[PDB]
Design an enzyme around this catalytic site. Structure first.
Site, mmCIF file in Angstrom:
data_model
loop_
_atom_site.group_PDB
_atom_site.id
_atom_site.type_symbol
_atom_site.label_atom_id
_atom_site.label_comp_id
_atom_site.label_asym_id
_atom_site.label_seq_id
_atom_site.Cartn_x
_atom_site.Cartn_y
_atom_site.Cartn_z
ATOM 1 N N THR A 59 17.799 -10.372 26.328
ATOM 2 C CA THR A 59 18.503 -11.170 26.881
ATOM 3 C C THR A 59 17.708 -12.083 27.817
ATOM 4 O O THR A 59 16.603 -11.836 28.197
ATOM 5 C CB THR A 59 19.808 -10.835 27.571
ATOM 6 O OG1 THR A 59 19.611 -10.122 28.806
ATOM 7 C CG2 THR A 59 20.855 -9.965 26.837
ATOM 8 N N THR B 248 16.665 -7.236 30.844
ATOM 9 C CA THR B 248 17.556 -8.297 31.592
ATOM 10 C C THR B 248 16.313 -9.020 32.539
ATOM 11 O O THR B 248 15.693 -8.334 33.121
ATOM 12 C CB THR B 248 18.280 -7.285 32.544
ATOM 13 O OG1 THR B 248 19.206 -6.587 31.871
ATOM 14 C CG2 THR B 248 19.396 -8.308 33.524
ATOM 15 N N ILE C 23 12.727 -4.647 32.679
ATOM 16 C CA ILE C 23 12.925 -5.837 33.534
ATOM 17 C C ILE C 23 11.953 -7.001 33.248
ATOM 18 O O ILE C 23 10.883 -6.860 32.785
ATOM 19 C CB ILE C 23 12.561 -5.629 35.056
ATOM 20 C CG1 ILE C 23 13.590 -4.616 35.649
ATOM 21 C CG2 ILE C 23 12.690 -6.784 35.929
ATOM 22 C CD1 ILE C 23 15.097 -4.650 35.548
ATOM 23 N N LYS C 24 12.721 -8.280 32.818
ATOM 24 C CA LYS C 24 11.955 -9.353 32.590
ATOM 25 C C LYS C 24 11.491 -10.202 33.390
ATOM 26 O O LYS C 24 12.257 -10.732 34.246
ATOM 27 C CB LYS C 24 12.883 -10.054 31.553
ATOM 28 C CG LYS C 24 12.048 -10.705 30.364
ATOM 29 C CD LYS C 24 13.316 -11.020 29.186
ATOM 30 C CE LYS C 24 12.925 -12.051 28.073
ATOM 31 N NZ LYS C 24 13.810 -12.210 27.134
ATOM 32 N N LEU C 25 10.268 -10.621 33.641
ATOM 33 C CA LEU C 25 9.729 -11.521 34.438
ATOM 34 C C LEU C 25 8.816 -12.810 33.821
ATOM 35 O O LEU C 25 8.187 -12.423 32.630
ATOM 36 C CB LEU C 25 8.695 -10.863 35.381
ATOM 37 C CG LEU C 25 9.204 -9.736 36.198
ATOM 38 C CD1 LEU C 25 8.356 -8.634 36.488
ATOM 39 C CD2 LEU C 25 9.720 -10.270 37.726
#
Lengths: 316, 316
Positions: free
Chosen positions: A33, A94, A130-132
């Site tokens: 997402t 996310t 964890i998306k960065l």
């Protein structure tokens, strides 16, 4: 058999959406997402329950309206991830607030906060990514997070300098884009039509894949952002591929087996010295497409984040 | 009287060229050069003597071909500055190798090296301005150089974040661009024609000028890069303006006095807290035009630097 089933022999299929209906239809291993997908998912009528729970939970944590909006927005993202984890055996990605993309310390803090919310719900770290954004600051944040047991998904990756820096930081996974690279060329170049094999986005991911396998890097390569099935088929063999529901449907309805395209059969080579910040900035900015798209991608995700806060604000 | 003479009442006139012929015709106070102008000037037949002296001097300093090319290229830039200083009462701006734009330490070293060459020729620091690109690294380099008695000219300035960071670093002078901003809008927007007062480049410099005077900053504001005289006249009153010979000619041939446009008549206001790197990066990248143009400007100057080295290489 169909294309989708055939692709699964060489590549792990991932669904790019926050809508659970797609999870049941295509049974992907993982799901991804981002801020825009979270904003859209919030529009889905059946998700109303998720929004109310987020708001209710927030009001139980503090009496500060400012803090309630942030707690509510973060909890909503987590609640949507929770629904998805019930339908997939793998991980959920996310994304952290894009407004912190150029702040290493703030990004680390936000990432730990999201991890905290997942843990409070009983979900362990091995089911999350964890998306960065892949700015120099985001990469430095990810290197630190991985050491603390938090796996990351480095997205909005356009230049080779970004890919190299990510591998050297030992991140769990990267999401190099394909489609957005095509968009840039169609709009800033003479050539408006590209054969699958010559698609700039396809060439980019292929070169990155080769560099990673050739040097024994463990970082997972997951191609993202697609405009047609031709791009997808040309990347068969990539570790994983996150695909939108619409293209997932097209693959499942077309007959005929496909052939593996991406492979590295040689032996592992020695790794070079690590790239420094100065070298990273010089090389990344040598790429006009990457310069435009990285900055643009961050701007858009920030705008969608603000729209979500607005929406939640009128509910407190 | 003519426009040029009239403009001198409100603004200090500076010539943007490495050709001494223009210094004699327009008698500017200062002169500015850059990598592209140095490359072009090297083509001027009469400058042949300057190139031979540079090469000869280089071969007398070392027997390392690699070091000779760098010494020769730097000496040529200085030799051209020396010729210009004979015809102008003010300063000459010489730019550091653009390939070091994202390296603070390397930029400081190169700047001191150029200063050394000018000093060896008997020229003191008060007649020189070292030119650096306005990246975060270039600004940090300039802040250090000013403390050591070396005045800087911060160029390739496009965003407000760049202007603010420069003022806070206490640099001697900034060169905000006008024309290149117009080019970006003409190519990426619907509107292809702009009235002088609505020219995006003109609006940018005007806002920067106001911010600087309003807060009592001592940094000199010098508008640069012009596409027509309309842009110049709209900025009458700016501290200084560096103009190409072609537009200098147009001003000197048109009759009619002009009126001052830029002024700040209020009282000085208190300065805010200093902007941090994270805030700088966020704000600068919010500007699509500035993102594209800063990176592009650096790429082009780097290419011209390489072409000059090639030219000098075939003479060693």
């Amino acid at each position: 058999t169909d294309k989708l089933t055939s692709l699964r022999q060489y590549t792990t299929v991932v669904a790019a959406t926050g809508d659970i209906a797609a999870m049941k239809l295509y049974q992907p291993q993982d799901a991804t997402t981002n801020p825009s997908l979270i904003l859209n998912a919030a529009q889905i009528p059946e998700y109303r329950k998720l929004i109310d729970d987020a708001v209710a939970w927030a009001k139980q944590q503090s009496n500060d309206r400012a803090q309630q909006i942030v707690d509510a927005t973060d909890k909503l993202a987590v609640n949507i991830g929770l629904e998805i984890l019930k339908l997939v055996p793998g991980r959920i990605s996310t994304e952290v607030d894009a407004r912190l993309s150029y702040d290493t310390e703030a990004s680390i803090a936000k990432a730990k906060r999201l991890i905290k919310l997942y843990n409070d719900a009983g979900i362990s770290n091995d089911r999350i990514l964890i998306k960065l954004a892949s700015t120099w600051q985001g990469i430095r944040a990810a290197e630190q997070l991985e050491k603390e047991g938090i796996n990351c998904n480095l997205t909005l990756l356009f230049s080779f300098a970004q890919a190299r820096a990510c591998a050297e930081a030992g991140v769990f996974l990267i999401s190099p884009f394909v489609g957005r690279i095509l968009d840039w060329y169609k709009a800033n170049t003479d050539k408006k039509e590209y054969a699958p094999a010559e698609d700039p986005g396809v060439v980019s991911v292929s070169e990155i894949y080769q560099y990673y396998k050739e040097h024994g890097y463990e970082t997972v390569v997951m191609g993202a952002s697609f405009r047609n099935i031709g791009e997808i088929l040309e990347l068969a063999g990539c570790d994983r591929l996150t695909i939108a529901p619409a293209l997932l449907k097209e693959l499942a309805e077309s007959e005929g087996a496909i052939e593996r395209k991406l492979s590295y059969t040689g032996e592992v080579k020695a790794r070079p010295a690590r790239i420094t910040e100065s070298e990273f900035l010089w090389q990344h900015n040598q790429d006009p497409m990457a310069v435009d798209k990285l900055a643009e991608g961050i701007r858009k995700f920030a705008i969608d984040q603000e729209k979500l806060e607005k929406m939640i604000g009128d509910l407190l």
